C-alpha cells in the first residue's frame, strides 16, 4: 500500500530530533503491568506490510507531495528513503526478534524488539512503530478470548467431568460488529487460536494465507435462522418458519432465533408442544440448538432451561447437574462478554445445569470493544547508540510510574522455577539463565521464521 | 476481495428459510433510541465493496469449496449466485436509498434502506446486511467526534468570544490504537468530517479517492516530538533535545512532549528558564506546543498552566479569561474522551483559562472504543412481498421492547416544526409531509449519487 504513509504523521519529522551521531535505536514491545497475554499476530503484519520490496521511486513521490500538502512544508525524509531504494532495493534494514507465536507470556515481559541494521537507517525503527503496534489487537482478541475459555473449561469440567466440545462453546458473531473488513478477518483469526466456531469467514482466508493449517479447516459453523427468516412468514406464523427451518436442516445441527416475539411461548407452546415432535425425532449429531437474543443473559438461560426441562426429558449426569435430551440444546448469542459469561455459568450451576446444555456467542464484546489499554500494550525505545557507545533509555513520568520503561538490551528468559523473566541492561549476555527465547523473525526485508497456525494453537493452550 | 464471503456464515444458509414464493426482501438501517447522528460512510463501503461487477465464475467457485469445509456440506447458493453473473454480468442487483452523506438526523429515524432488485435475488437484500452494517463505525466516530466539537465550541465561545480555531482543537492520535490499517483509514476520515487535524495520513487517501475535497488541506499536522526523540539524548539531556527541536522547527508550530521525566521541571525550569529565550523569540504563526502525556488529565492542564503563567507574560481578555503569550500553547493528548474532555474545559473555566490556550488530542477513545451499541445501530427487515401481496414485518420482543422494529416501507420526511420523522407502513405514500429525503444511491451495481467530502462536512457542520 505505502509504508511511507503507514505511520503517525508527526514521525515523518522525527528523523531530525534524534541526538546527532546516533547510529542505533533499538525499540521493544510489551504489555505493561489479564496477567498473561497470548502473543499472536505479529507474523501477519510482517508478511502483509513489511516483508519484501516496499519502497519505490513512485511511493517516495506519493509520500512527499502528500507529506507536503499535509505539513504545508517539505520535511519528509526523501533523502534517507532512497538510500533504502538505491541500496537494499526497497527492503527495510531492520531486525525483529519476537517470541514463538501463540506463546502465553505473563506481564511486564518483552515480546518483541526492533532495531535498525544500517546506521543510516537509525530513523526507521520507530517509523514502523505504528503499523507494528496494531498487534495490541490480534493479541487482545486472543488473550481476552482465551480467558473466557478457562472460565468455560472449569465450569464444564466441574459440571460434566470433561472438556468434551469445549472448543466450540464460544461462537464469534463479530463480523457485523467490527469497524473494518480487514479487521473482522484479523480478529476472527484471534478466536480460532482458541475456539473453532466462527461466522466471520474472513478469519480463515487470513489463517491459511499467513499461517497455514494442515488440519481439516480452522473454523466452522452451522445453519441458523436470523430475525428476518422468521418474521418474513408473518406475525402469526412463527411456528410455520420454526417448522420450515427444522425439516430443511433436518439434515445437520441447526440454530433458530426464538425471541422474535416472546421467547417463552416459542419455547413452551411452539417447541414444547406443537413442534415437540419434529424434534425428539432428531439425532444427537443434528441437535436443534435454540437461540435467545432477549434481556439479561442469566435470567433468560435459566428460565428457557426451566421451560425445556418441563417440556422435555431431563436427565442428570454423574455430577448431579441436569442435562437435556441429546437432541436439544441452547446458545446465548447476545449479551455475552467475559464479565457476563462467568455470571451465567455460575448461575447455571447453582441451579445445577450442566454447562453443556449451553454454548455461547459474543458479538462486538469479542471482536470490538477491545483497547490497547486493556493490556497496556506499549512500544518504547530501550537502547540507542550515540557516537559509537550505547546508552540505556526509558521514560519515567513522575505523575506516573508503571509507565517506567525497561532499560537497554532486553532478553526474555525462562526461570528455573517455571515462568519467564525479561533481562535488562544487556544483562542477558551473562548466560545466567541461558538462551534468550525471542527469535529473529525478520531481518532485512525477509521473513526468517514463521509458525503454522497449528503451532500457534499448541503454544497458546491451557496446559 | 470476494463478496461471497463478506457475510455471516449462517446467512449462506438463509435462502432456504424464507416463506416460499417470496420475491421482495426490503430492509432498513437505523440508530434505535448521543441523540442525533451523523450519517457518514455508506458511500465508501457502498463503493469499494458493493459497486461494479462483483460476482464471477471463480468467486463462485472459491466461495464454493470454502462454504463446504466450513459447513461440512454444500448449501451455498451456487445456483442463485450464477443468476446474478449470467444475468447481470456480476452486478449485485439491489437498490439502496440513503440520506445525504453527512446528514445529522435524530434517533429512531430511517437512515438507509435496501431491497433486492429482481424477484430472483430476494435473498440478496440481507446477505449484505453485514457489509452494510460495518458502517455504524464511520457514523459513530463522526458522531462522537462531532459532539466533542460542541463541547469545545461552547467553552471557546464562552471564554474567548468566537469559534476561532475550533476545526483544530481535537487532534486524531488514533493510528496506533485502532484494530487494523483499513480501520484507521475509515476512522480518521470520520473525524475530519468534523475537525481538520490528523496524524493519520491513511484517512486522507480514503477521502480523496472516495469523496474528494476541493480543499488543499483536508487534514493537517505539524512536527512533534515523541518519547524516543527525547530520551535518546539521555536521562540528563532532556533539554538539549528540547532546544534541538525548537531550533530545527523554528518556523512552524512544534509540539514537544514534556513528561519523559517530571513534566513540571520541564515546564518550570527547562521551558521557563533554561530555554525560555528560544521561546519568546517565536512568531504566533508558529508557537511552541507543550504536550503533557501522563497524570490526571485535568489536575495536569491546570498546574501546567499555573506553572507557565508564572514563567510567561499572561494577558486577560474581554470575557475575563486569561490567555498566555501568542508564541506558547498546550496540547493535551492522552486520557481524552468525550466525558473527560468536558471535565477539562469546565474545570479550566472556573479557574479562568480560555479554551484557546489548550487544544486536545485523543487516540483510542477517538478511533477505537466505539461500539455498535452506542446509537444501537441496527439493520432490520420491515417489508417483504410473499405470494404477490407483501407484508409489513417487524420484531417485538418482551425482554427489550425497545428492540421493536418498524413496519412496512419507510420514508424520511421533514416536519413543519423543523425536524425529521420516519413514516412507516408505506404510509409516506399519502404524500403529505413532502418528499422522502432519502435519495437513491446504488440501483443495480452502479453508484447513482455520491457526495464530495465538502458537502458532507457542510451537512454535519454545526449549529
Ligand atoms: O448461531 C449462529 C450464528 C448466529 C449469528 C451470526 C451472526 C450474527 N448474529 C448476531 O449478531 C449480533 C451481534 O451483536 C447478535 O444478536 C448475534 O447473535 C448471530 N450460528 C450457529 C452457531 C452454532 C454452531 C454450533 C455447532 C455445534 N454446537 C453444538 O452442538 C452445541 C453443543 C452444546 C451446547 C450448544 C451447542 C455448538 C455450536
Ligand atoms: O502532538 C502532536 C502529535 C502527538 C501524537 C501523535 C501520534 C501519537 N501520539 C501518542 O498516542 C498515544 C496514545 O496514548 C500517546 O502517548 C500520544 O501522546 C501523540 N502533534 C502536534 C499537534 C499540534 C497541532 C496544533 C496545530 C496548531 N494549533 C495550535 O497552534 C494551538 C492553538 C491553541 C491551543 C493549542 C494549540 C492547534 C493544533
Curated annotation (Swiss-Prot), chains A, B:
Positions of beta-nicotinamide D-ribonucleotide binding: 199, 291-293, 333-334, 364, 372
Gene3D superfamilies linked to this entry: Aldolase class I (3.20.20.70)
Family annotation (Pfam families): NAMPT_N, NAPRTase
Binding site for diphosphate: 176, 227, 291
Superkingdom assignment: Eukaryota
BP GO terms, sorted: cellular response to amyloid-beta; cellular response to hypoxia; cellular response to ionizing radiation; circadian regulation of gene expression; circadian rhythm; female pregnancy; inflammatory response; microglial cell activation
EC number: 2.4.2.12
Top-tier EC class: transferase
Sorted UniProt keywords: Acetylation, Biological rhythms, Cytokine, Cytoplasm, Glycosyltransferase, Nucleus, Phosphoprotein, Pyridine nucleotide biosynthesis, Secreted, Transferase
InterPro entries from the UniProt entry: Aldolase_TIM, DUF5598, N/Namide_PRibTrfase, Nicotinamide_PRibTrfase, Nicotinate_pribotase-like_C
Tissue: Expressed in various tissues. At the highest level in liver and at the second highest in heart. The amount is higher in heart than in lung.
UniProt cross-references to SUPFAM superfamilies, sorted A to Z: Nicotinate/Quinolinate PRTase C-terminal domain-like (SSF51690)
Record pathway: Cofactor biosynthesis; NAD(+) biosynthesis; nicotinamide D-ribonucleotide from 5-phospho-alpha-D-ribose 1-diphosphate and nicotinamide: step 1/1
Compartment(s) of residence: Nucleus; Cytoplasm; Secreted
Residues the record lists as Phosphotyrosine modifications: 168
GO MF, one example: nucleotide binding
Residues with the Phosphoserine modification: 452
Catalytic activities: beta-nicotinamide D-ribonucleotide + diphosphate = 5-phospho-alpha-D-ribose 1-diphosphate + nicotinamide + H(+)
NCBIfam families: PRK09198.1
Protein family (similarity comment): Belongs to the NAPRTase family.
Subunit note: Homodimer.
Protein name (Swiss-Prot/TrEMBL): Nicotinamide phosphoribosyltransferase
Amino acid at each position: 500500500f505505502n509504508i511511507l504513509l503507514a505511520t503517525d504523521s508527526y514521525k515523518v519529522t522525527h528523523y531530525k530530533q534524534y541526538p546527532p551521531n546516533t547510529s542505533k535505536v533499538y525499540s521493544y514491545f510489551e504489555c505493561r503491568e489479564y496477567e498473561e497475554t497470548v502473543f499472536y499476530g505479529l507474523q501477519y503484519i510482517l508478511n502483509k506490510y513489511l516483508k519484501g520490496k516496499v519502497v519505490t521511486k513512485e511511493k517516495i513521490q506519493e509520500a512527499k507531495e502528500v507529506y507536503r500538502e499535509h505539513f504545508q512544508d517539505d520535511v519528509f525524509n526523501e533523502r534517507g528513503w532512497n538510500y533504502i531504494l538505491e541500496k537494499y532495493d526497497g527492503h527495510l534494514p531492520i531486525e525483529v526478534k519476537a517470541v514463538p507465536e501463540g506463546s502465553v507470556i505473563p506481564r511486564g515481559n518483552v515480546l518483541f524488539t526492533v532495531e535498525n541494521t544500517d546506521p543510516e537507517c537509525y530513523w526507521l525503527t520507530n517509523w514502523i512503530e505504528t503499523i507494528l503496534v496494531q498487534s495490541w489487537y490480534p493479541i487482545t482478541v486472543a488473550t481476552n478470548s482465551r480467558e473466557q475459555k478457562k472460565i468455560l473449561a472449569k465450569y464444564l469440567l466441574e459440571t460434566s467431568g470433561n472438556l468434551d466440545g469445549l472448543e466450540y462453546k464460544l461462537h464469534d458473531f463479530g463480523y457485523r460488529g467490527v469497524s473494518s473488513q480487514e479487521t473482522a478477518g484479523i480478529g476472527a483469526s484471534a478466536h480460532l487460536v482458541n475456539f473453532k466456531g466462527t461466522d466471520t469467514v474472513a478469519g480463515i482466508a487470513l489463517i491459511k494465507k499467513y499461517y497455514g493449517t494442515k488440519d481439516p479447516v480452522p473454523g466452522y459453523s452451522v445453519p441458523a435462522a436470523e430475525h428476518s427468516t422468521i418474521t418474513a412468514w408473518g406475525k402469526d406464523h412463527e411456528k410455520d418458519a420454526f417448522e420450515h427451518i427444522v425439516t430443511q436442516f433436518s439434515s445437520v445441527p441447526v440454530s433458530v432465533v426464538s425471541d422474535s416475539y416472546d421467547i417463552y411461548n416459542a419455547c413452551e407452546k411452539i417447541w414444547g408442544e406443537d413442534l415437540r415432535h419434529l424434534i425428539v425425532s432428531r439425532s444427537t449429531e443434528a441437535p436443534l440448538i435454540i437461540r435467545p437474543d432477549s434481556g439479561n443473559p442469566l435470567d433468560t438461560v435459566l428460565k428457557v432451561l426451566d421451560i425445556l426441562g418441563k417440556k422435555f426429558p431431563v436427565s442428570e449426569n454423574s455430577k448431579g447437574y441436569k442435562l437435556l435430551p441429546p437432541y436439544l440444546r441452547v446458545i446465548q448469542g447476545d449479551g455475552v462478554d467475559i464479565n457476563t459469561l462467568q455470571e451465567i455459568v455460575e448461575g447455571m450451576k447453582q441451579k445445577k445445569w450442566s454447562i453443556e446444555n449451553v454454548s455461547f456467542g459474543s458479538g462486538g464484546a469479542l471482536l470490538q470493544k477491545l483497547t490497547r489499554d486493556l493490556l497496556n500494550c506499549s512500544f518504547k525505545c530501550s537502547y540507542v547508540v550515540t557516537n559509537g557507545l550505547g546508552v540505556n533509555v526509558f521514560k519515567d513520568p513522575v505523575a506516573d510510574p508503571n509507565k517506567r520503561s525497561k532499560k537497554g538490551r532486553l532478553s526474555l528468559h525462562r526461570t528455573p522455577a517455571g515462568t519467564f523473566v525479561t533481562l535488562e541492561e544487556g544483562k542477558g549476555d551473562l548466560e545466567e539463565y541461558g538462551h534468550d527465547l525471542l527469535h529473529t523473525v525478520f531481518k532485512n526485508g525477509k521473513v526468517t521464521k514463521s509458525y503454522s497456525f497449528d503451532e500457534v494453537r499448541k503454544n497458546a493452550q491451557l496446559n
